[PDB]
């Protein structure tokens, strides 16, 4: 198996959302991941796995799972706190068979506290920590940024960091430990820049009136003549200048870039200019420039974009594109992910693993 | 220094956005991070560092930088590709003095390809890979989800995963290597669940008309009587039922949860219900059940929320709150972050580092 994590052994207890995303990336980077499900997937997320089944409620299934775990470097579970405990797969039971184990617990609310036993989804975790409030236009109710911030950016990505950090630790202690990855925590560290900026007046709690939330005319999307969109990210003055130059707008006729009182005016002039030609016109105009103007591509156009083609950011799988592994490694590179395959015998995996 | 990365040595070449956020998390987890800037910060992001200065364009500063890199495990740089090369600090130069170095390159577009020399910001990277298009209400232009998805979720977080994975590879190869972390790549892997769902009919390219983008009446925010908001995330039928009960709605008088044709009707009945009382009323109705209803808190209210208080997700600093380290480790726990302190002499760090 190719990649920097070649040799690493991971048991994943089948769940939804952040846990399988974390397992996927481990497999992408070359880890040997074995997912235990209940008694061929068309879910591309289950790439780079071997799937086995066990009833964790039976004596036989518990025993087979504990034998797998005994040979593994990492366990990923995403149930409610207390669930693995009651199954006999809790941290203390795993430690008896394998004290080198990195026991990774993926939850929204965390292992303890008043909400720890309560159901939730991404939108709920980001509603409690100020994140969701900060997303969307100021004249409307907050919009969910899909499940990118809670489930993934502040969820599976923190599980991954904790797993890999604890493996580093084990190189010198010889021992594993438990990683408590709560999406409410991870997402807060994900948005630390905004917490930093609040303290210095560089960010306000007012929705849609900051530099990065759509409040700034030079950091937003604009609708073009064809009803398609461009993104403008021209924060730095020399980038802003390049953007005006391509629009053919005279700076001396516009409000200054950062005169906030005239941002309505500035936005209306930029709106009119971008609305005068189609999206693809602006790709030609701004070619090879620092104007920070890009087309807003829909998913179904992405694979035709030259920078995406040339870098092989995606690969073609089962009637659709899927993202290639990230990040990239110069010496031990990842390969194209292996598709989901048929279930296999758990006894066969133990034998492979010894 | 407390945490699982105690003993790790990191040189950070001062930059903005993704690079310093990755350095921050390494520090938060115990790494010994030394940031080289140009010749006391009030930026909480620069916590858990030592700051030194050097003019990398001069013979003396380059030589001092190279001596630091000689002793480090990890180098973080976020300039345009080619910049460290021309300074004398490219991967091939650093390998000469330290072949165990993890050379970590944080860009938007990546090290190669047609856009790789062009300026940009978060909004631009997520415009090119279909993510930005997918965010916001269907009747308005796309809204940026701040810089959470490109800079951090698909940016620093993949740089971290690359660093830590390469450290694992290094344990058996005895060598480091170069990590190419491009935001356009990382963010695509962050959104892999949507790429999966597109291939199985579970996601459309139509904006604002999906299960997780605000298209579903049971996965969105609602405005309450006081003009404040709740978030509803009641996907599963049992969670949906608990939500209807809290609202005092009789299920028999509503359309079925997943009768999409009647989702306008359902949303209108849900709108009217939530509008009848203020946010904190619903926060109390729904405080314990599995209804998946949470109050939408603004940043300045977060620290008063019980679940946030009890788990110490935040700590006080400067004049406000900052997130504590995440994720959490049961044996080698992180400490409260150290604030940015005064600059120090580079030669002293070299002494300490031997």
Numbering used by the authors:
A (entry chain B), B (entry chain A): 1 to 39, 45 to 359
Text taken from the publication that reported this structure:
Crystals of wild-type MCR formed under a new condition [0.03 M magnesium chloride hexahydrate, 0.03 M calcium chloride dihydrate, 20 % (v/v) ethylene glycol, 10 % (w/v) polyethylene glycol (PEG 8000) and 0.1 M sodium HEPES-MOPS at pH 7.5] after 3 weeks of incubation at 22 °C, and these crystals diffracted to a 1.65 Å resolution and belonged to monoclinic space group C2 with a dimer in the asymmetric unit. The unit cell dimensions for this new crystal form, where a = 181.15 Å, b = 79.16 Å, c = 59.24 Å and β = 91.15˚ and the diffraction resolution cut-off is 1.65 Å, which were selected based on the CC1/2 value and the number of unique reflections present in the structure. The electron density maps for both monomers within the MCR homodimer were of high quality, except for residues 41 to 44, which form part of a flexible loop region. Each monomer (subunit) within the wild-type MCR dimeric structure has a large and a small domain; the large domain consists of residues M1 to A188 and R331 to G360, which come together to form an open α/β sheet structure with a Rossmann-like fold. The small domain has a distinct three-stranded antiparallel β-sheet core structure made up of five α-helices and five β-strands from residues V189 to P300. A surface representation of the MCR structure shows the extended binding groove, which is made up of residues from the large domain of one subunit and the smaller domain of another subunit. Within each active site, the side-chain of D156 sits parallel to H126 (from one monomer), which is hydrogen-bonded to residue E241 from the second monomer. Sandwiched between the D156 and H126 residues, a piece of electron density corresponding to part of a polyethylene glycol molecule (from the crystallization medium) was observed. A network of bound water molecules was also observed within the active site due to the absence of a bound acyl-CoA ester.
α-Methylacyl-CoA racemase in M. tuberculosis (MCR) has an essential role in fatty acid metabolism and cholesterol utilization, contributing to the bacterium’s survival and persistence. It catalyses the racemization of α-methyl-branched fatty acyl-CoAs, converting the (2S)-epimer to a near racemic mixture of the (2R)- and (2S)-epimers. The enzyme enables the conversion of α-methyl-branched fatty acids derived from cholesterol metabolism into forms that can be utilized by M. tuberculosis for growth and persistence within the host, a key component of M. tuberculosis pathogenesis.
